[PDB]
Amino acid sequence: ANIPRSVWDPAQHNPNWSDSYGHDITNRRAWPARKWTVG
Amino acid sequence: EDGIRGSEVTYKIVLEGFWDHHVMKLAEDVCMFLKDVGRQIVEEKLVAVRRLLQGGAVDPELLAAFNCARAGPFGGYDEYDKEEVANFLRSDLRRLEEQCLSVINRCNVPVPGATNIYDPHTSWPHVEKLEPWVRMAEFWTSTAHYEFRKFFRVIICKLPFQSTEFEKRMYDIRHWLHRQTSCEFHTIYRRNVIHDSAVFPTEHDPATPTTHEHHRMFSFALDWQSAPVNRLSTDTVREGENWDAVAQRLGCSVGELKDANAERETIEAGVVINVPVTAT
Amino acid sequence: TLHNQRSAAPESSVSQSHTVNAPTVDECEMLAERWGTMNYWHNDTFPRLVVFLKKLLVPDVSPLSPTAESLLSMFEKVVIPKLTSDEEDRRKLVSLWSETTLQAEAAVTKFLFQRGSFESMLHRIITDALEKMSTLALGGQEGNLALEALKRQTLFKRNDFIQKRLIDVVSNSAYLGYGDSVWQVFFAAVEANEENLLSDRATTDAIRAAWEGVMREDVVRLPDVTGVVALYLTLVCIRESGRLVPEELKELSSGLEDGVRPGVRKLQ
Amino acid sequence: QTLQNSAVEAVGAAPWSILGPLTAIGPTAEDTMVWLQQHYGDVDVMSIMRWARFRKGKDLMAKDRPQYLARAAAWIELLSKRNREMEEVPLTYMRKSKPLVLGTNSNVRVAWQTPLMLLAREEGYVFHHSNSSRFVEETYQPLHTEVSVKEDFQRLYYQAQKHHKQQE
Amino acid sequence: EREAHMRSFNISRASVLQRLEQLSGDRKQESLPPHVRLDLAVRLAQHGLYQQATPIVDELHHQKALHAGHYALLINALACPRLGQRILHCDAQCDPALTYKLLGDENGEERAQEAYRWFDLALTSLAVDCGGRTQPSQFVRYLPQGTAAASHITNALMRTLLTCGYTHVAAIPDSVYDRMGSMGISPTISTYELVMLALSLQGNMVEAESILSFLRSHHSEHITVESFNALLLGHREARQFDCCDAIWQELVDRRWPRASPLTA
Amino acid sequence: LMDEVEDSLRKFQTYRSRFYEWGRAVKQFDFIEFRRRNGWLYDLHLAVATAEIPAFFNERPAWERPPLEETLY
Amino acid sequence: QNKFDIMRREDRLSKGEQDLTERNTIHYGVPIQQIVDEFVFRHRNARGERPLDYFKPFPNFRALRLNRMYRDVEGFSLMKQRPEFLEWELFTRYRQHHQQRRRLALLHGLEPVANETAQERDTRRHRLDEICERTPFDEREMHVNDDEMKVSVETLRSWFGVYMLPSPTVVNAVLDTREHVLSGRYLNRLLLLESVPHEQPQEVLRHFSAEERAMYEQHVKEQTSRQLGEWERAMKRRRWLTDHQQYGHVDRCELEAFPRNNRGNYVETQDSIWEEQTASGQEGWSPATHADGLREGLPVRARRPIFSSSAEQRIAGGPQRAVIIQYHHQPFFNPEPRLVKVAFQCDGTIMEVPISDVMIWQRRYHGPERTVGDESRRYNPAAMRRYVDVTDPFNEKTSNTEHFLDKYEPKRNADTVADKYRTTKQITEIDKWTRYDSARADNYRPLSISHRRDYIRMGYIPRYTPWEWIAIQEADQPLIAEQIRQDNIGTSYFFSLNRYWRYKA
Amino acid sequence: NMNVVQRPCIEDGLLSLVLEAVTKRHPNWVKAGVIQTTLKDPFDALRWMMHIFIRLSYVPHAGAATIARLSRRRIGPIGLEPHQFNVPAELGFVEQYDNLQYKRYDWQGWYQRMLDVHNRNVSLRCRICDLQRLDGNGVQFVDMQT
């Protein structure tokens, strides 16, 4: 066919595929530095 | 070979652009394209491979190809069976199945959460980097140095079979290529070449050997024929030549002369005969 | 709005060629004509070679009882005088008993690997002896009893031979390394005996060049072969492993390969 | 010859070779023509016979009569489809099947057994086969008894006749 | 071109009906040899004049001139090959799949019913002709179902019933096949080819592919290009174009059997 | 089927000889003029909510308001 | 248009299947990627639906996904559709136990088979049960998740009883501080220890006449007579002997009474799921990829190499069962070709086998880690209330072990009243939804751009060309005849370079 | 010792029986000269197994070519006669087409011709390993001296 079955067929959907917003939100996430007592 | 090294047709797409990030993003797009296209094509090839393994019939053309050689490895004449031919086919199709499965698994590996398209082991196809073409020019202004630059990325697809459908879908990329980006295609494919010992025979080195004069300046145009040199396939029969006399004069066997000239039962003087190609 | 097209799950990526399933009745029926790798014939869980050998067994062949064996042993010279006294008649009895003995012995070994042919030949021999002794018109039916005893004797000899020197030799797939030990031992033996096989005076240039061509591949994948040929390879490699393994393992060893390669790092 | 070979290979050395579709040739040239036109009528048998006359210019029917006969018969059989549909090898009968009443393995399913060893489709018996397909007779806490997916009617007839002969 | 084909078919049909009438006028009291009558009935059924041929086959059967080959010949000619050719070139737009659909309207059920009549007659004649023999061994419980003639006749029946509309195309993968199983007739390759074609026309590809898988597993050397043709046709009907592509690709990969212009 | 095959061939096929001249300004301008003259005979045109959807508008000039697409990049 | 087609349509509808006319057009419905992205866009990152690991630093792709009830919870008997105090930890322990059973089956060749009959299945399960009860339970492989705390066997067994998590002595009693892998037979014993067409309403009858009343009563009396006759046919059997095929009224033969028409045991349920998927083909031996995850103790099927001094290159053998000792994932430690150190079961030999000659047991089809199974997540009713320490998202300062210096530490109340609340932050306050997020492109390749989200998106430029656009561009242009490259004839040695001058070489 | 197993010992008579069975199963082998039922020399059994291995693992050149044609779709002629040898080779070429500026106007043609003649090179490469195979006449096509 022209359009591969993996795109539209629900049976062939990749379980490990993730959304398009969460990974980038996580990357933009800023974690405050681990503040120790001396260093 | 097995795994990554093994393949039959290697396609390389050299993508050229004016900016490294432009070409990188175009390479990512083309990979996400070719990954799925090759996945579907290798899938529909795997179906046929599995069906052929489950059971099939031997082609008489294939069996004749196997029992074509005059003398085999074991002594002289050899006689293969369709069962043996099917065993050879089974071995080839098993290795093809392994290659197709490796391709499919590598196609399924990459995922947005963790993807690396520059590693041949992780994804299929993989992108390898190529040194940018840089041309610096210095000119009056008091002098100024400005350099043209052109960045490249090579997308490599190694398939264990020739798919003209895949070649078509790969060629059709230039129509939706990215803005101000170009592409060129390199194809390395396995092709069968015959060495016809009849048109190109092995002969004793002539009595009078060539000297350096025959390989002089402008000798390539005046002294030498283009290979191959024509060898007369047609002969005329001399006077009173016996059937074996003609064969001996042609250096061919009587049986093969008969096979070549089965039209005529007997030889008459001045008639035209067809010299067998293997005549020495 | 799922779709209107048909749906199919992605085609399995598990190599069906390498995966081996449980045997099927038709596969066992055609086992005499099927091909397979040494792995197929010595599968750790489904020993198709053992199945092929057991297919040669004649069903319902009980071992000879002491009574029947004693009757057979004594019938050669004790019964004949009892049932007849004519010199010619007892000579014919002795001749036919020696015949039936040698025909049974030849039937046990000659028609191995072809059970139907063995059965047909054995039945024909027994029947011919039957009508010939009936024409002789012996007094009692102790001749028929002895012939039936010899039938059981021949059947059990065949079954015991095939169960002892054919099936018991191969039943240990783990010892045979699931078939790959067979190939490894073959290659080791060929390397050891290259002076006897591949030398100038050993084999012709055609065979030699074929051998280098086979071994020169990028990967020398081994061939899948018929069941009988697999049995031949297993047996001959068993015969050859002794000549290669050191003296300390020529008889007892924890595996067919044990001692073939010196540097193999084991675990313990 | 071909039909006898097929019948014999059906068992492995049969009732298949009792009645071939070819009828006897009458003792006349008109009968020859009728037989050819009614058993190989899809082609022009006379045209094939005329064409098969010469081989590299040598008149076969005039010099090598057996060679010409073999060549013409082979050409007639090749070009005549009816010969193809008459010269099949007797295959085996395939069983339909239904999924197990209780689902243990989708690859193993209950076969349909011919009364030799109640229409099939009404219950749900249908063609289903693959490389890993398994056919069984299921009873019971399932209990299974594997059965062949195949019914070689010719071999069953030959073995039943062998049993008849031994009873004889 | 369509006009030319229609004119050819009409001229041939008129000539055959004229021959039938001339022969009947001549046979008011004289009886012709069985072979000319067999040929004329075959030609009538070929041109679609099945109802014109029932009397000829009935009288030949009563006179007991038909044999194993002749019954199958008549049942095959009953499928109307010449009429099918005319329909293919003229009204089916050269579509082999639509040719079967268009042939079924032309007295499909009546033609199939008479085909069953011929099947019963053929089985009775086979039993008589095979019981009349003495050299073959008893097989008293296996005559004629175990002989090649019964399988040939059944294959002819299935081939003819293919063209008799949907009611019998749905039957070919059905009672007909179970009826053959109960009758104990060994199928040949053509049997499974016709069953696959019938299931393809019906549009149910799962069982057609299962049948081809059975053939691959057990009888893999007898598979003919007709199985691939039937699968292509059935996938065209079901509109599984990816599947049809897969079969074409596997066929081109497996040069044997040779792809036919019908396959293309 | 041959009519349809030839239709498909004339749609997707060209030779190298045709290709080397495939793109001359003369041929392309002939195409343009022919479309203008007869589009009503061969053009297919001779869904709505896709092209008709309200869109955000940057009221202020680009310098005054950093465009959103420019800030993204 | 065809009677053939109409009959096919009606027959297929009666059988209950899709009609071939419905397929006259192609309808690729909205894909799951589209649906999921629409859901997350409408729900503003679906922070409520995502788990804790997502809000932990540097999450894995499994954490980046949304919570789903996978095929692993199905066997658990006590799950109540809602959270409770220790059942989730017990379910996790059972899940690890079944993963251990899977590992043992792969090591010892008790893995399921596609053609397994019931007898073979039960024999394989019995041998697996023996091996699993004999082996101890590994606690290292027990991988906790952030949402739950590690719970010891001592306390879990004390609370739930000893039957839930038994000792080998308890198991032998049913059929000592030790744990062994659960057994299907053992749980089976524990569970055993529990003990009229075309009928119209009255409104149409109101419009009806009375002659039709008599006719309708005649219709319904025939209908009910036929149904009652069939029902009492069900009770008349006579065992249906084949000699006369007797039906009724005076288990011998033909099995009369043939008319026309454990979800609690966790180990059995999960095992049956395993056979279902193995038979379906989702699970089975497939070639191993570098990304599937190779580690110590992974049961693998490698192809044993054969060594020959006359071989110009390696010789491959049959795929034998084996276990991975190590696998240097670093490229500088595995130059091409890559190698894996694996130990074979037969002869116990350890060898470095090429990675290409290695086959793993895939739990699914898509990878990238297809060796390891799915892990279901916990559900939270108040998913909006959820706290994580920003400065210490992981629990480092908390030590499960007890140190000998802890009795000199000060009291925990003073720092408890302050530091916990200072470092704590609700998941809502750790991430913000920005216009960049609203305008983010789709990481996958869409079929055709969808305007469903065009109202609040802005500056969205796709990062991948849609399949529809690609198809349009590919259709818009022709092919080049020579690109096919067919050479079935051969090379002309005499004329190809002496062709006509116009088209000469 | 519990792990240790005893190596079985078999007899040349049993080997001869199995060899006879193998010859029965594959009659064409003895006819072609691969196997002989005779088992006289001590190394004769291993010699015959080696011949079996060579027959089962050695592909003739014409065969290999035909198989490559069948499923892998390898183009090129296939030679059957003993005077034709099949050489599998690699043909590497380049195809460049323009879409930016030299796509759709007068310079399109001569620019395309320039690109094609610039990429006119085709690299034909073959492995001497593949050339080292038995000819149709039974002699190695390329020996060490060749």
Side-chain angles (χ1 to χ4, degrees), chain C residues 109-178:
Chain C
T109 195
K110 183 178 289 316
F111 286 69
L112 207 45
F113 308 127
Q114 62 185 357
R115 180 178 44 71
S117 193
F118 165 80
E119 290 203 335
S120 81
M121 193 64 74
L122 182 145
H123 178 88
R124 184 265 294 159
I125 285 158
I126 282 165
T127 54
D128 300 343
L130 273 169
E131 71 269 14
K132 187 259 285 167
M133 60 83 74
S134 85
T135 305
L136 188 72
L138 190 141
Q141 293 176 2
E142 200 170 3
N144 310 326
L145 185 144
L147 291 175
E148 190 285 333
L150 188 142
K151 184 177 180 180
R152 167 171 308 92
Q153 188 272 331
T154 315
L155 282 176
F156 180 68
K157 267 194 74 175
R158 178 190 170 86
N159 271 31
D160 194 78
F161 190 91
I162 207 169
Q163 164 56 230
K164 292 292 192 321
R165 296 154 65 74
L166 275 299
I167 284 171
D168 280 327
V169 169
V170 178
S171 64
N172 204 353
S173 64
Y175 178 71
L176 294 174
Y178 306 144

Side-chain angles (χ1 to χ4, degrees), chain D residues 15-16 18-19 21 23 34 38 82 85-86 88-94 96 114 119-121 126-130 149-150 153-154 157 160-161, chain E residues 35 69-70 73 130 133 137 142 146-149 151-152 159 175 177-178 181 184-190 192 210-211 213-214 217-219 222:
Chain D
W16 183 259
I18 300 308
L19 266 170
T23 317
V34 163
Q38 71 199 11
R82 202 186 302 291
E85 290 91 7
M86 291 188 301
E88 287 86 327
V89 180
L91 304 191
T92 56
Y93 184 89
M94 179 187 173
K96 292 185 176 63
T114 306
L119 176 68
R121 211 194 168 88
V126 72
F127 297 92
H128 183 279
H129 186 272
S130 58
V149 310
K150 170 187 321 190
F153 286 144
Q154 298 301 294
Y157 299 170
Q161 197 276 353
Chain E
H35 49 78
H70 303 125
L73 188 67
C130 185
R133 290 179 171 176
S137 184
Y142 321 116
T147 190
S151 185
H152 190 257
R159 189 173 291 103
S175 177
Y177 194 69
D178 318 292
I185 315 179
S186 65
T188 50
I189 185 63
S190 297
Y192 295 107
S210 299
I211 291 174
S213 183
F214 172 90
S217 179
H218 305 277
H219 312 270
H222 317 117

Side-chain angles (χ1 to χ4, degrees), chain G residues 384-416:
Chain G
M384 62 92 73
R385 264 172 189 174
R386 186 184 289 168
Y387 294 91
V388 63
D389 273 338
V390 174
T391 308
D392 208 338
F394 310 135
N395 309 304
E396 283 76 328
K397 280 84 178 183
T398 312
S399 63
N400 210 21
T401 44
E402 172 51 25
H403 203 244
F404 64 91
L405 293 171
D406 187 81
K407 57 191 178 96
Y408 310 114
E409 175 195 23
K411 299 300 216 181
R412 212 182 301 267
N413 49 0
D415 51 340
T416 302

Side-chain angles (χ1 to χ4, degrees), chain D residues 91-108:
Chain D
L91 304 191
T92 56
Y93 184 89
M94 179 187 173
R95 298 178 161 105
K96 292 185 176 63
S97 62
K98 68 158 175 177
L100 299 161
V101 302
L102 77 174
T104 66
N105 182 334
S106 180
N107 286 96
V108 73

Side-chain angles (χ1 to χ4, degrees), chain G residues 231-249:
Chain G
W231 199 66
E232 59 88 18
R233 202 271 303 167
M235 287 83 77
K236 70 176 74 70
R237 281 75 178 272
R238 274 199 271 187
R239 300 283 84 184
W240 190 263
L241 190 68
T242 310
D243 54 358
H244 195 255
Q245 292 182 357
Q246 54 260 49
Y247 48 104
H249 328 296

Side-chain angles (χ1 to χ4, degrees), chain G residues 122-188:
Chain G
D122 72 33
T123 294
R124 188 187 54 73
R125 281 183 177 181
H126 175 82
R127 302 190 292 131
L128 182 54
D129 287 322
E130 301 176 356
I131 305 286
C132 83
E133 56 80 14
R134 170 170 75 70
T135 189
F137 176 80
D138 264 345
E139 306 79 354
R140 308 169 302 167
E141 276 180 28
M142 182 73 209
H143 274 143
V144 67
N145 291 124
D146 51 4
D147 193 358
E148 61 252 48
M149 74 308 291
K150 304 153 184 277
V151 174
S152 74
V153 183
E154 186 177 322
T155 188
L156 190 152
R157 197 185 280 145
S158 84
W159 200 66
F160 283 115
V162 291
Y163 297 156
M164 200 59 57
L165 277 297
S167 175
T169 52
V170 178
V171 175
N172 304 329
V174 174
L175 282 177
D176 175 14
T177 308
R178 293 189 307 273
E179 188 177 14
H180 290 288
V181 184
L182 274 66
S183 190
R185 50 182 315 109
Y186 166 82
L187 289 189
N188 286 124

